[PDB]
Nucleic acid binder design. Structure first.
Lengths: 50, 113, 104, 150, 128
RNA sequence: AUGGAUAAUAAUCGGGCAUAAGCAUAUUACCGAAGCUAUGGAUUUGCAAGUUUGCAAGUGGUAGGGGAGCAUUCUAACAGGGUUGAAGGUUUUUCGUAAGGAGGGCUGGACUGGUUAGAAAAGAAAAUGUAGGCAUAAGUAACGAUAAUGCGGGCGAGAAAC
RNA sequence: GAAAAGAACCGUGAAUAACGGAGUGAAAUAGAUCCUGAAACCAUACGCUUACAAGCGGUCGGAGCCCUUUCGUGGGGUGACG
């Protein structure tokens, strides 16, 4: 109707607050999402395709 | 844009530190010592709530036993003869009667005995 | 004259002019309630102890207000695992004022 | 906001009434008498017992010299009294200990059935263990209580 | 609130007689030793104690008390001084801004030395 | 039940202690957990009424997966507050499952912020993390060749060192 | 600090060290370490406890003593003892 009553369709917008590594209580915290030690938990890991 | 949570950063810890009021030493003003003590205090407060319900029943049982042994009886026999008589009075009320109204307690004892 | 009555789920020491805090009752504020669950009476001269739910005995009260108790913080935490959670909890209560203990 | 409305009243120091019980230990076993003495001293035969208050009575054992042990315990009971110095563990006997101040038998028997606290060390000061047959309290009017009526 | 009103209400120092000694190049822990002997004493016993004290922190504390006495005499102009019977109501020794210097320790390192200061405040009060 | 050696700081039925308060069988009452039940309340799926209610099954949790949200900074619209006192700091009351919201007193003396939508330099308790400030050890080590000082006058408020 | 109007002058003090007054200002607890000015840290006054009693210093019960009060199975502080 106006520029102060804009409302998108139900289901088009999402959380947008989900950040990884923001304390225990929001889910992904501590060991952010990579489990414990290993090559797949190091900064800059890339899966070799072949 | 640059966002700094400076005011609420300390307003959040002021509320958690205001409940560490009366703690010995630096457990009341130092932040990283007060936060470690408030959480443990809340952990201790979660329990002891299940224990307050079984530490008062012990006191009630002891007082009922004391009030029943004045009439040449025991707590076990008294509770047996009370439960197998259709009375249904909890130990709280029974101890309150044994402590404050010995006439009512001995009346109950003579009725169930 | 004092009696004991199981009102909601617990027994009390109801007097003639007492104010009691009981659990949340399903009655509007400022209404009359009657409890026919008197387990023991004593009118200062005789204790008419009997089977539960004495026939003629009934305690009448009036509902003053529906309120909530002090907030308690339920805090659970497991050390070295990173698991913790704290929740506030209040208790719904109803205040009643006793206005009569009809015996027999 | 004190939302209980029905509390359990606990006795205070201004409401307790302490008596001056006198107990004859002529025919009695050591532990069999000490258990009842400790229960009376703690205070559990009154329907007003609070666990944190010094309730109860004051016990006066008036025949401690005439107590007896059942088996060969008078000759085979040992008390250890380590002092703190290297090699300072002293061992007494039930026969030697009653040769000097026979009241120590009943005293050490009662001390050990107490809560082992500040309240429990203050309860031991209410116990009077007399070696003879007459006490020295006098103007207190103590009443005799038989331990077989409890 | 109106700041002029708050200041006019807080300007009640026209009765209390006090004295201050700011930026004294002495440590507070060494003057708190001589302040305890003076706290609560009479205005002349305190002077004698400060004059015969075996501490270098009293030579400049014995004249702060004289300045406080003079301020009391200025504020209470109508009246003598020996009939009032002054004493030492409160005396506080606080810290101050300290200077930082360096001392060369052995083996090419440097230690820090803080030359400390202190602030002294005294109020007299009267017996009357 | 009894004899068949025991390890080095003082020892053990947990202790007192018990001749039963030990052991074997049988019986009764009682105590005994966050188990079960009684009362109040909240929430997740499935089924119906609608536009929250009713019933059933649930509701420990690490690695990990999913869903609803709070605060912070800024922007677009509409609607506001403030020198009769804004932001900020300090106490207090109340509300919510929580992150948090709102109100009052004191200091403070100019900005601030509601609703809907959007963006991100968007949240610390630990990295022998960085910078600044301040404690503890403590009035403790030390005051830097064991060639040495004593007295009398002078200036001076003040002299073991001039 | 809007503008130096940046404290003439008097007293203590050896002192143009500091302070107390007096004038400027709306403010001097805006005084040149100068807007508001928190936390760590260092002290003083007041209320309650503490010299026979052993340990993550808290939590659940619990007298006694001090303030407030819509007057209360109301609030705040300290808390002997379990």
């Amino acid at each position: 109707m106006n520029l102060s009553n804009l409302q998108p369709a139900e289901g088009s917008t999402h959380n947008q607050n989900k950040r990884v590594g923001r304390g225990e209580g929001s889910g992904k915290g501590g060991t952010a999402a990579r489990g414990h030690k290993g090559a797949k938990s190091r900064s800059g890991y890339s899966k070799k395709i072949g | 844009p640059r966002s700094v949570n400076s005011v609420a950063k300390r307003a959040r810890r002021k509320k958690i530190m205001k409940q560490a009021k009366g703690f010995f030493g630096r457990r009341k003003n130092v932040w990283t010592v007060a936060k470690n003590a408030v959480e443990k205090a809340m952990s201790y407060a979660y329990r002891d709530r299940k224990q307050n319900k079984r530490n008062f029943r012990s006191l009630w049982i002891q007082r009922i036993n004391a009030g029943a042994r004045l009439e040449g009886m025991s707590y076990s026999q008294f509770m047996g003869k009370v439960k197998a008589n259709g009375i249904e009075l909890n130990r709280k009320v029974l101890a309150d009667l044994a402590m404050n109204h010995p006439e009512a307690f001995k009346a109950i004892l003579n009725k169930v005995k | 004259m004092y009696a004991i009555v199981e009102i909601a789920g617990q027994q009390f020491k109801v007097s003639k002019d007492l104010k009691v805090y009981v659990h949340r009752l399903a009655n509007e504020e400022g209404s009359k309630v009657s409890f026919d669950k008197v387990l023991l009476l004593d009118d200062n001269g005789n204790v008419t102890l009997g089977a539960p739910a004495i026939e003629g005995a009934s305690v009448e009260a009036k509902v003053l207000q529906h309120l909530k108790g002090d907030k308690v913080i339920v805090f659970k935490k497991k050390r070295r695992k990173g698991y913790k959670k704290r929740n506030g909890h209040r208790q719904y209560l109803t205040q009643i004022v006793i206005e009569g203990i009809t015996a027999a | 906001m004190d939302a209980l409305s029905y509390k359990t009243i606990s006795a205070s120091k201004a409401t307790v009434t302490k008596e001056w019980i006198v107990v004859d230990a002529e025919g009695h076993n050591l532990g069999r008498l000490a258990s009842k003495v400790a229960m009376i001293l703690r205070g559990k035969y009154k329907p007003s017992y609070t666990p944190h208050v010094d309730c109860g009575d004051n016990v006066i054992v008036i025949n401690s010299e005439k107590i007896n042990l059942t088996g060969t315990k008078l000759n085979d009971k040992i008390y250890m009294r380590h002092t703190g110095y290297p090699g300072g563990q002293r061992t007494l006997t039930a026969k030697v200990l009653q040769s000097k101040n026979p009241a120590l038998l009943v005293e050490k028997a009662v001390k050990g059935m107490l809560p082992k606290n500040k309240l429990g060390a203050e309860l031991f000061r209410n116990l009077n263990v007399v070696v003879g047959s007459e006490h020295t309290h006098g103007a207190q009017k103590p009443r005799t209580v038989n331990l077989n009526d409890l | 609130r109106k700041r002029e009103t708050a200041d006019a209400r807080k300007e009640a120092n026209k009765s209390i007689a006090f004295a201050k000694l700011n930026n004294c190049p002495t440590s507070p822990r060494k003057m708190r030793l001589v302040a305890d002997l003076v706290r609560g004493q009479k205005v002349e016993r305190a002077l004698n104690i400060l004059r015969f004290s075996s501490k270098e922190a009293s030579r400049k504390l014995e004249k702060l008390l004289l300045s406080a006495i003079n301020n009391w005499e200025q504020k209470n102009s109508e009246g003598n001084l020996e009939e009032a019977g002054l004493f030492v109501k409160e005396i506080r020794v606080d810290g101050g801004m300290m200077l930082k210097r360096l001392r060369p320790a052995p083996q090419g390192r440097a230690h820090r030395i803080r030359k400390r200061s202190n602030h002294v405040t005294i109020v007299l009060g009267a017996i009357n």
